[PDB]
Design a protein around this ligand. Structure first.
Ligand SMILES: [Zn+2]
Length: 362
């Protein structure tokens, strides 16, 4: 059942050691302290990009709080089968090597490595603070999103590390119900998992009509991976068959790419073993691929925000992924560390009227 993951506790003041406490080279060429809370999962208490607006996360005390609060979310997530399973995939995944102009494979690539003050370090996901908007929660690869990058490494089976922007102190309420940040963080990590294995498919699919959104039986469309990430009623058995199909196509394509190199091929096969939960997965024949990717679809079909929510049991999630922006209310969490707990979540629940939520923050 549960695969042990050691999620490490740090204080922001803990010295850089070049092992689990490092300095990440940022876009401006300065350095932010990074903490490997787990293998290949780097937590960076800093703002993302150049901030000139809302200053949050500049002080040591705020950096320490961010570190503690995000670690609480990760430990909570890891307490549940769904969360633990997701984090394992993220830890164990390996983006495929790239080919140079000679057709030779190279292992040390920007898809696999971040720059640090001591040089290149292997990262699968970097979790860091938001940009200029403190509310931003987003999973990027190479500075780009799910639908931003046609034929990107996030969607072509080769895979790429992600950066997640996320603040646990500034949140959104849907119809007076503040989204639980463990659910939102799980959401973003599902995106990072898809990116890591190069299975973040952008393909538009139709979603069920929503009476309190659509009109005159005109349904909406959304990206397949988005519907998969959220899950619930919006995700249909047909969506999942589209996913199975896309997976099989991807494996066929990637097989052809790595066929020239044993090491590169072995990495791919390792990935397939983790995704499929089958040590004996093969890609020798079309049939092997179809069977293998079926196991992959089944295995990742339960890694959805709705499934995670269900498993927690005592937290609320909105019914549909699609929201109209008239239902949304920003909030600030007061004294997160005392009001949101590892085993409990929000101590008095997610209603916006609770004292530890400030509506329409400064
Ligand atoms: Zn999403």
């Amino acid at each position: 059942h549960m695969i042990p993951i050691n999620i490490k506790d740090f204080n922001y003041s803990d010295p850089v050691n070049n092992q689990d406490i490092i300095l990440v080279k940022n876009e401006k060429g300065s350095f932010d302290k990074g903490f490997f809370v787990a293998d290949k999962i780097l937590l960076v208490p800093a703002r993302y990009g150049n901030i000139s607006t809302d200053i949050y996360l500049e002080t040591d005390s705020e950096k320490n709080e961010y570190l503690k609060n995000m670690t609480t979310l990760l430990k909570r997530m890891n307490s549940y089968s769904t969360g633990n399973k997701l984090l394992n995939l993220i830890i164990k995944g390996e983006p495929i090597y790239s080919k140079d102009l000679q057709g030779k494979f190279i292992e040390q690539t920007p898809s696999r490595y971040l720059d640090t003050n001591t040089g290149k370090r292997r990262v699968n996901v970097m979790i860091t603070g938001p940009g200029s908007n403190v509310l931003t929660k987003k999973c990027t690869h190479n500075g780009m999103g799910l639908e931003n990058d046609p034929n990107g490494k996030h969607s072509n089976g080769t895979g790429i590390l992600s950066t997640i922007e996320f603040s646990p102190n500034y949140l959104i309420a849907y119809n007076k119900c503040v989204a639980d940040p463990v659910l939102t963080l799980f959401h973003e990590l599902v995106h990072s998992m898809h990116n890591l294995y190069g299975i973040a498919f952008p393909d538009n699919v139709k979603v069920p009509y929503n009476a309190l959104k659509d009109k005159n039986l005109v349904s909406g469309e959304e990206a397949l991976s988005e519907i998969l990430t959220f899950g619930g009623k919006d995700l249909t058995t047909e969506h999942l068959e589209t996913l199975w199909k896309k997976l099989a196509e991807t494996v066929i394509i990637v097989k052809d790419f790595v066929k020239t190199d044993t090491q590169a091929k072995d990495v791919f096969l390792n990935n397939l073993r983790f995704l499929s939960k089958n040590e004996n997965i093969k890609i020798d024949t079309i049939e092997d691929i179809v069977n293998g990717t079926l196991k992959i679809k089944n295995n990742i079909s339960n890694l959805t925000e709705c499934e995670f929510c269900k498993e927690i049991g005592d937290v609320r999630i909105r019914t549909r992924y699609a929201v109209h922006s008239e239902d949304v209310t920003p909030v600030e969490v007061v004294d997160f560390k005392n009001n949101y707990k590892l085993n409990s979540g929000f101590l008095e629940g997610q209603d916006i009227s609770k004292k530890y939520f400030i509506t329409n923050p400064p």
